[PDB]
Amino acid sequence: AGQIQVLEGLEAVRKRPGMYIGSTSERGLHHLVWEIVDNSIDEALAGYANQIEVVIEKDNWIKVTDNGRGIPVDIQEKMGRPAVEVILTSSVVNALSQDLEVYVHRNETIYHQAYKKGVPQFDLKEVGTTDKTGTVIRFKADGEIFTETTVYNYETLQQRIRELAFLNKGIQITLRDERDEENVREDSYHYE
Numbered sequence: 377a378g379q380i381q382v383l384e385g386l387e388a389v390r391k392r393p394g395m396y397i398g399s400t401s402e403r404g405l406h407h408l409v410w411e412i413v414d415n416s417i418d419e420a421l422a423g424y425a426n427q428i429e430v431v432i433e434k435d436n437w438i439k440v441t442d443n444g445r446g447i448p449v450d451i452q453e454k455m456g457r458p459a460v461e462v463i464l465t466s467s468v469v470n471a472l473s474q475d476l477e478v479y480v481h482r483n484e485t486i487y488h489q490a491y492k493k494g495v496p497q498f499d500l501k502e503v504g505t506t507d508k509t510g511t512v513i514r515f516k517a518d519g520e521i522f523t524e525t526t527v528y529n530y531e532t533l534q535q536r537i538r539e540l541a542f543l544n545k546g547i548q549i550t551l552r553d554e555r556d557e558e559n560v561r562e563d564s565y566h567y568e
């Protein structure tokens with residue numbers, strides 16, 4: 377029933393990414409991180425998260441982790457599908473990613489799903505157990521969309537992360553660049 381409105385949202389985002397993110401250039405690539413990080417910052421504003429970690433991984437995957445509630449997994453009556461899957465299939469970031477993965481820690485369970493260009497590659501599954509709550513999102517910007525550059529710039533991430541931790545007092549926000557195994561760089565911000 378409601379599966380059809382989700383697929384027009386993806387085509388739209390992907391024909392006119394600019395309308396959603398400003399550009400398909402370097403600046404838009406970095407907007408993808410800001411979208412995901414803002415969700416984690418809302419977990420902390422809600423009172424649940426206090427730590428957010430942003431990692432630039434090998435082959436320019438971005439990994440964002442928070443220790444908030446974990447995205448819900450309960451079945452939605454209208455879609456018939458887990459809440460996380462609904463949430464992530466209307467995500468601009470996901471649409472503009474050749475690959476995206478989620479891990480949710482919730483209900484003493486670790487759940488996993490992956491997507492390409494916004495489309496679920498398999499059903500939500502329980503892959504492990506946990507005594508923490510939170511959410512991990514890893515995504516790789518789509519080279520068929522980001523046809524100029526899919527390489528992140530550390531100082532641009534660093535700059536904004538620091539401003540965000542300064543604005544949002546009490547949240548520990550860490551940035552790490554792991555792309556060169558031989559020289560890993562980390563900056564961790566925590567105000568008050």
Ligand SMILES: CCCC(=O)Nc1sccc1C(N)=O
Nearest residue numbers: 415416419444445446447511
């Ligand atoms: C109780 C609702 C929690 C939720 O939707 N959280 C979301 S939606 C997308 C990201 C995240 C996150 N990082 O917690």
Ligand SMILES: [Cl-]
Nearest residue numbers: 448449450482
């Ligand atoms: Cl749940």
Ligand SMILES: [Mg+2]
Nearest residue numbers: 411412414415
């Ligand atoms: Mg948003």
